[PDB]
Symmetry: C2
Subunit: 294 residues, 2 copies
């Protein structure tokens, strides 16, 4: 089934057939390996879940921060995006043997790889202009000049750099593909928290694909998310069973007002979501209170 | 579906709905993006296609060569495995700007990345003992010690070294996973020649999974092949439509007579296929 049903069906598969495993800290999960979801980006569609409210402004500011090749959690915190703060904290960096790292300095995580792959990392505020392999720039050019290319790979998976990172990347490799004037993206995510990180990854990479299509005169096509270890934390099970009861509404549309000459110069003002109408869950809570009584 | 039916269905889908694209040279393909297939390795099964005869000996000798970390096409050619000879030729190396490279020296392709990731490449005959990141050794150790780990990644996609390679890798990244004492492997293949390379990759990474399970006291679980650009060349179409008319037979079983102490010391004599019955 299409659209949001690909996500809900994944949740159900893990609840019903997942294996009882443990993570790094010994907290309980249900787990399967290798599932895939596919989302249309046609007719301006952007797969932002309707069965719960996604933090859209967080999706955008994180993605633009990636695109700039930035790695300072403090720059997101200034925009009131706090999702990277815990990974940049003194305690977290210390637990990874990053004793000489300033608070907020995540190291060469996603963005740095996207724009500066193979460069030597100094701090999150050093000037990395023309350093390393600009994977994202290379793909944009290839999309303009030779869109049939089968090597349009962007990876954050550098085994030399993993020990310098707050955490090893999980949305780790993407491939782009063009057919009939349409740009598709597949993401390989080795580890996906299906209750929390995965809905965010779907919105984030779908947005990246709409933005990249802008840059290169193509239309958006599909976003494919392929997972390694797809898991649900035991603490989320009950909330996710209630989410599965909620009928999806149509996905919102992304409206782009302009595209700048360089993709790192996108600002949040240049595009918006039209028709985003997520569940609040109030009607379901009312029916639970009413049904209990009978 | 069952294993081989997933391969035949993928072929049907590309012939039926694929897009008319071109490759590097401008030679025609039909193409889709993002298909997946899944093969059970339970009960000793190994997905070697029955609807045509796979070059099993070529599968094994190429895989062992990868596992040793070797990159000399001439070592394969000595065992009458010639699948790498064209990419190691004077003409092909020159077309890549590798004018200083001895014939058959492919550079730091697949196996060098598996066993020596990040080491400086000299020639295919240099001694790379204890050089670079031994990704494969790290995973086998993680499998014994911490089989729930979610970072059991092996990659050949090293952007720094792509220009040194006869070809950029297409079977580029694998992940390993364990549940219930079973070892599963997912391969990311960015570019699959569905008519020729893909049946090979399925046999190769399925064999790798059986062998790795051997080394670490686990049973084989599944192999998942995830494609990027999955394509059929125009010249393979007639032969593939005839292959689709053949009813699959049950997959062979892999028998392992022994596992050596180190995975790079496996030889073809240490395992075989039992009950392989392909169509002629």
């Amino acid at each position: 089934m299409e659209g949001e049903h690909q996500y809900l069906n994944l949740v159900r598969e893990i609840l019903e057939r997942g294996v009882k495993k443990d993570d790094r800290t010994g907290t309980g999960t249900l787990s399967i390996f290798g599932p895939q979801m596919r989302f249309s980006l046609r007719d301006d569609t952007i797969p932002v879940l309707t069965t719960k409210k996604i933090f859209w402004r967080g999706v955008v500011e994180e993605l633009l921060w990636f695109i700039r090749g930035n790695t300072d959690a403090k720059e997101l915190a200034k925009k009131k995006i706090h999702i990277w703060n815990a990974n940049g904290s003194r305690e977290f960096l210390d637990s990874r043997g990053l004793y000489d790292r300033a608070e907020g300095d995540l190291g060469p995580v996603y963005g740095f790889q996207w724009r500066h792959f193979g460069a030597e990392y100094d701090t999150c505020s050093s000037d990395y202009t023309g350093k390393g392999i600009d994977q994202l720039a290379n793909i944009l050019k290839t999309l303009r000049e030779n869109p049939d290319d089968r090597r349009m790979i962007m990876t954050a998976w550098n085994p030399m750099d993993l020990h310098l990172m707050a955490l090893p990347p999980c949305h780790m490799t993407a491939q782009f593909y063009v057919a009939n004037g349409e740009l598709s993206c597949q993401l390989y995510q080795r580890s996906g928290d299906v209750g929390l990180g995965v809905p965010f990854n779907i919105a984030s990479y779908s947005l990246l694909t709409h933005l990249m299509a802008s840059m290169v005169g193509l239309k958006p096509g599909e976003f494919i998310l392929t997972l390694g270890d797809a898991h649900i934390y035991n603490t989320h099970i009950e909330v996710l069973k209630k989410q599965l009861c909620r009928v999806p509404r149509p996905f919102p549309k992304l409206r782009i007002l302009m595209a700048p000459e360089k993709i790192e110069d996108f600002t949040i003002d240049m595009f918006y979501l039209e028709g985003y109408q997520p569940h609040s869950g109030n009607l379901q809570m009312k029916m639970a209170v009413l049904e209990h009584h009978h």
